[PDB]
Amino acid sequence: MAEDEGYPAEVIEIIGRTGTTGDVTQVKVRILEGRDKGRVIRRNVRGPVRIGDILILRETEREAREIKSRR
Amino acid sequence: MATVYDVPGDLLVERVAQRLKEIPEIKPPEWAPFVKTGRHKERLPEQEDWWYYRVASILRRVYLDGPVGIERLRTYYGGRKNRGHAPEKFYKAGGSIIRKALQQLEAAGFVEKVPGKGRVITPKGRSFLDKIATELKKELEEII
Amino acid sequence: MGKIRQGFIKRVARELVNKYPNEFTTDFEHNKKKVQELTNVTSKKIRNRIAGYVTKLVRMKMEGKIL
Amino acid sequence: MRIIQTTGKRKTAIARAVIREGKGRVRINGKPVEIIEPEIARFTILEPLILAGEEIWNSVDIDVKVEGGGFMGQAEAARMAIARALVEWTGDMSLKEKFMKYDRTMLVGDPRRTEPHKPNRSTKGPRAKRQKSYR
Amino acid sequence: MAKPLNERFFIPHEIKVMGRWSTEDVEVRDPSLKPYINLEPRLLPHTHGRHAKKHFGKANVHIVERLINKIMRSGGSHYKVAGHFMRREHRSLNSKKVKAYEVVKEAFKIIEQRTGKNPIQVLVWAIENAAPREDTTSVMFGGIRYHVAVDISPMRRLDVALRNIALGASAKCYRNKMSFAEALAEEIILAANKDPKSYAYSKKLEIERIAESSR
Amino acid sequence: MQKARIKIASTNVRSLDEVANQIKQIAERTGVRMSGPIPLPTKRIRITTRKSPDGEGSATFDRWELRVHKRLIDIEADERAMRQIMRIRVPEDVTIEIELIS
Amino acid sequence: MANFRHIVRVAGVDLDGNKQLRWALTAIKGIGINFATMVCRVAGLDPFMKAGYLTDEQVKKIEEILADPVAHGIPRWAVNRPKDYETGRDLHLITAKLDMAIREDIMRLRRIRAYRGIRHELGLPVRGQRTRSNFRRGQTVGVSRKKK
RNA sequence: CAGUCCCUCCCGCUCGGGAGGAGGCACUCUGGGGGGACUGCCGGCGAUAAGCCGGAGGAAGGGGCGGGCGACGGUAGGUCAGUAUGCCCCGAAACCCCCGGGCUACACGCGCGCUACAAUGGGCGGGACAAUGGGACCCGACCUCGAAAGGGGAAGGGAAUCCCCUAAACCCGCCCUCAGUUCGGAUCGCGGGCUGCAACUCGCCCGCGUGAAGCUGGAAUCCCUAGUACCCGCGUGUCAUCAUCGCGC
């Protein structure tokens, strides 16, 4: 294919879980790609993911979030 | 420098079978492939190869074991006969091909019946197999 | 799923270090031998737990707060 | 010469394996390795042998008897026992650690093996309940 | 056949997969897939691996062993033996990974016959492509129902990829000349192309496309 | 002398061990030459059973176990010599079989 | 080869295929898969070769063999019906004999007033057991013998 | 043919491969007893406690793992048709003996299973592999007759020492070449064996001939979380015989 542009981002921290399914887990990301660099986003990721993994972000401009929490 | 041990059966069996034709003391009797077959057959094959392979493996079996039965050679084969929707169950070959096969060899002088009550190889039977194994085993190395 | 050490296992070790502190160590094996001599061995598996908790209880005693 | 007698066991295929100096014998249950009809599981045994290298292989006679009901399972038992035989032979850390890195089925067995068939509620298979539709 | 096979024994030893396919021939260029795949390790897929032991012990599964297992899947009550015997071992193993392995091997042979490239380089390529990047899960959280954008993790991507490739094979594989070894083999090529003939790649696009709308 | 085989089999673990150990110890010092007590099996008998007379519900089903464990002794001695050793108390429920051959 | 044709006539004017010889005889009633090969041995032909690779000559042999299998050979349990209606030693069955022989023995049974004879008429398995809720959902066994 | 001075056979390119018996208890194993695993150590979170994650060493780990183990009670749950037992009823009968029939009837409807819709295939042939167990009017070596089912003759075994016994899936080479068929095995004709006084009703198995529906299944719905599931065969109870069952490997 054409790229689009692939924005590679790695996951800085795994905040907690979202979905009534549960199926997204919400994770905080940092970017490492040619354009922006450094931008912190809270993306909704699915499936087994650990800390320090790599995600290709299809759309830079995103960041839906919902928050709480552990006592 | 070889033994039936040494030699992958697939090659051995065709070789021992051809030697059986050659020598030519063992032979197909007519009645046996006709319809006096082992268990059930989808088609019944009209081959010299059929009869000879059957005998080829009795020579290998008689070497490996000591007393080896008719009953033992019959069961050993693997193969199953239909019982319907009730699942298949194991059953065993013909007694017919075996008793005559053991007997055609006996006259050949290749097998003998021990006084023990059993069956064991002669020097002549054992000899025929290792020579063939040496030929086969020698051929195996040459070929890539 | 979960782990929590029974209560019976906790009671024996706690009494044992109180009676004989200075005959207990930071070695698992040394405490286990002592524990065997001290109290009845219903079984081998419980003997090990008692000994283990004793190892910890000594480490804690150093600190100056031992619950 | 020397006799060293080692075992491998994977899933209760049990390998009674001897290494002695010799010439390159590979024996399984009395017969050359060659007899085995499967290619695939032969390539499992060959893996510790190549990893040490062929030099050692040629210099020593390994006879095994692998008394396990699996055809894969024999390949399995023979591979663990060869890896251990090779490491006792030369005695170096080099060959042991090289093996641990590549896979741990070469020098560890399994911590378990099998589970019984549970009683059940009049249905086959150890983790199974009789089908329902009673709603 | 037997001598070639012996040669097939000489060559894997040296070290190749299935007797004649160098693992070094391929590399994972993309860094994402690199720990996610088992292209770097060894020779026989029969491994008994016991993966799924830990968190991600399923990632140290040889790519081909995942394929044989995923490939095995379909199988109900029924019995198989050499006899009159089954099907019970399926279109897709109503059975044995042991047998299951053969297809993968014949499929490997067939794909090599056409393309003439190292068929792990084709299958590895196809798994990278077949995995959809984006998915929509009907995810409602907090009770509010969204049909949202979800980014696929890499383990999840491989898993979708292999399952989808296998799934498609069976469909055509249905009472038709493709032989799953053939059907798979033809699928592995096209899945590799992103071609219009790959039931696996059709869902790959469509799942992302619907997902793109829904996000 | 006559070589005599004492075969001793028992339902429980406890009883068979006491007898074997004592037979060897009494036998050890005298005219006797004795081969060390040898364990032969538990043929472990399963009897697999349904609990519930109902047959109904879930059933929780019984795995039974009867273990009978066999120890085999050779002794070289006279017949008179055998009775002396045989004197022992023996655990209720310990089968002792004797073979006598030259 | 032995002279192609895609249709040859064997066992009367009933047609012979290009499927395989053994299999084309199986279609012809009263000559089943296994019986075909027995006749093939006697006749001297290759069993595995395509049907229709037969001169006119080959065809004559198979027919005389069919008429009295028993004269040529053919064991007295391997032959189609042996001990026929209590006073025939052995006979052959083909399309016209086979139809007739089963239909006669059934006809006999209606008249004798057997359970057996009436059980078929009603449409029922005699010694199959159940009729209880087999042939479910308006289905039928179809009893004897053909709906293709 | 662990290791072997010996020994008998076969084979040989004389280098060397394999089997028997001496011999030898190494090994596999049997069953009896002992160690080892406890957050003990190390780091992070947490009240420095309790616990949770993570890491090293290690054969194994943080309920290691799999069973037995199920309170007080309820559904007036289930069994007086296994036994025990209150009450009531029956007394040439609601008893008792007997033969035969009935439980195995069917236009249908459902539950629970088995086999199955073929090339990831059949036939044919060869060759490598197991375990739980069961075995005295019982398992039956082996030999012989029979196509087989089975029969005749007969060794050993009341058992780590014999027998059922062959594992099946597996693979290789060959024939075959995607049809309602060489699928699938219903149905029916005939021949025959076996137990029992006897298998029409109403037994299984062999052989020939016949050769059905079915070519991937709506709504709806069930199981299960790893050496399990999926998948393959093997034994056992009961027991002559009906197993597509139940228990177990």
Chain B partners within 8 Å of G75 (Cβ): 34-35
Alpha helices, DSSP H only, in chain B? Answer: 9-22, 31-34, 48-64, 70-75, 95-108, 123-141
Contacts of G137 (CB under 8 A, 6+ apart): none
Could you tell me if G75 lies within 8 Å of chain B, comparing CB atoms? yes
CA torsion through residues D89, D92, D94, D98, sign = positive
Residues 24-63 of D with CB under 7 A from strand H: 25, 27-31, 35-40, 61, 63
CB hemisphere CA count around B18 (13 angstroms): 7
Contacts of C30 (CB under 8 A, 6+ apart): C24
The CA distance from G100 to G93, in Å, is 10
Nucleotide nearest to C60 (CA to C1'): H48
The CA distance from A56 to F2, in Å, is 88
CA torsion through residues B107, B113, B119, B123, sign = negative
Question: Which amino acid type is present at position F2?
Answer: Q
Q: B102-108 long-range CB contacts below 8 Å, 24 or more apart?
A: B102/B58, B102/B70, B102/B73, B104/B26, B104/B27, B104/B29, B104/B55, B105/B26, B105/B55, B105/B58, B105/B59, B107/B25, B108/B23, B108/B25, B108/B26
Q: With an 8 Å Cβ cutoff, are B46 and G37 in contact?
A: yes
| Closest in B5, B9, B10 to D32, CB measured | B5
Residue with tokens 């001695």: F77
Residues 167-186 of E with CB under 7 A from strand H: 169-170, 173-183
Task: Tell me if A31 sits within 8 A of A41, measured CB to CB.
Answer: yes
Contacts of C62 (CB under 8 A, 6+ apart): none
Residue nearest to nucleotide H79 (CA to C1'): F54
The CA distance from D35 to C63, in Å, is 68
Closest CA to G89 of G71, G104, G116, G103: G71
In units of Å, what resolution does this entry have? 6.6
Could you give the 3-state DSSP secondary structure of residue E128? Answer: helix
Residue with tokens 């081969």: F35
Task: Tell me if E192 sits within 8 A of E202, measured CB to CB.
Answer: no
Closest CA to E135 of E153, E158, E111: E153
Q: With an 8 Å Cβ cutoff, are E3 and B10 in contact?
A: no
The CA distance from E18 to E8, in Å, is 7
Chain D partners within 8 Å of B140 (Cβ): 34
Nucleotide nearest to F14 (CA to C1'): H32
Tokens of D6: 């080692």
Contacts of D135 (CB under 8 A, 6+ apart): none
Tokens of D115: 């589970």
Tokens of E168: 């498609």
Closest CA to E61 of E75, E80, E47: E47
Task: Tell me if D95 sits within 8 A of D59, measured CB to CB.
Answer: no
Q: Read off φ and ψ for residue D79, nearest 5 degrees.
A: -70, -35
Alpha helices, DSSP H only, in chain E? Answer: 2-15, 63-72, 97-115, 119-130, 154-173, 180-193, 199-214
Q: With an 8 Å Cβ cutoff, are D121 and F57 in contact?
A: yes
Omega into D104 within 30° of 0, i.e. cis?
A: no
Could you tell me if D77 lies within 8 Å of chain E, comparing CB atoms? no
Residues 45-84 of F with CB under 7 A from strand H: 45-48, 50, 53-54, 56-57, 59-61, 63, 67, 69-70, 72
Could you tell me if B1 lies within 8 Å of chain E, comparing CB atoms? no
Could you tell me if D91 lies within 8 Å of chain F, comparing CB atoms? no
Contacts of C37 (CB under 8 A, 6+ apart): none
The CA distance from D119 to F64, in Å, is 12
Alpha helices, DSSP H only, in A1-71? Answer: none
The CA distance from F10 to F94, in Å, is 5
G108 sits within 7 Å of strand H by its CB: no
Q: Which of E7, E9, E81 to mutate to test the interface with B (most CBs of B within 10 A)?
A: E81
Task: Tell me if B4 sits within 8 A of B12, measured CB to CB.
Answer: yes
Task: Tell me if E45 sits within 8 A of E52, measured CB to CB.
Answer: no
| Closest in A19, A56, A62 to E141, CB measured | A19
The CA distance from D80 to G120, in Å, is 66
Let me know if chains D and E touch, i.e. at least 3 Cβ pairs under 8 angstroms.
yes
Tokens of F77: 């001695």
Could you tell me if D100 lies within 8 Å of chain E, comparing CB atoms? no
D98 sits within 7 Å of strand H by its CB: no
Q: Which nucleotides of H are covered by protein (CB under 7 A)?
A: 1-3, 9-13, 15-19, 26-33, 35-41, 48-54, 59-70, 77-79, 82, 104-134, 140-150, 154-155, 159-160, 164-192, 200-213, 215-216, 221-234, 236-237, 243-249
Let me know if chains C and E touch, i.e. at least 3 Cβ pairs under 8 angstroms.
no
Let me know if chains D and B touch, i.e. at least 3 Cβ pairs under 8 angstroms.
yes
Could you tell me if D120 lies within 8 Å of chain F, comparing CB atoms? yes
Residue nearest to nucleotide H216 (CA to C1'): E174
Q: Which of B1, B4, B5, B60 to mutate to test the interface with D (most CBs of D within 10 A)?
A: B5
The CA distance from G75 to E141, in Å, is 80
Let me know if chains F and G touch, i.e. at least 3 Cβ pairs under 8 angstroms.
no
Closest CA to E187 of E97, E125, E117, E100: E125
Task: Tell me if E36 sits within 8 A of E64, measured CB to CB.
Answer: no
Task: Tell me if D107 sits within 8 A of D84, measured CB to CB.
Answer: yes
Q: What share of chain F is helix, strand, coil (3-state, %, to 5)?
A: 20, 45, 35
Residues 103-142 of E with CB under 7 A from strand H: 103, 106
The CA distance from F59 to F53, in Å, is 10
Task: Tell me if B13 sits within 8 A of B53, measured CB to CB.
Answer: yes
Closest CA to F46 of F73, F32, F21, F65: F65
| Closest in A18, A49, A56 to E133, CB measured | A56
The CA distance from G19 to G47, in Å, is 12
Structure-derived torsion over alpha carbons of residues A15, A18, A22, A27, reported in degrees to the nearest 10: -40
Q: With an 8 Å Cβ cutoff, are B42 and G33 in contact?
A: yes
Contacts of G87 (CB under 8 A, 6+ apart): none
User: Min CA distance, E26 vs chain D (Å)?
Assistant: 19
Residues 78-97 of D with CB under 7 A from strand H: none
Could you give the 3-state DSSP secondary structure of residue B82? Answer: strand
Chain E partners within 8 Å of D110 (Cβ): 50
Tokens of F79: 């017949």
Q: With an 8 Å Cβ cutoff, are D119 and F57 in contact?
A: no
Tokens of G142: 């179809």
**How many of the other CB atoms lie within 10 Å of CB of G105?**
12
What is the Cα gyration radius of chain A? 13
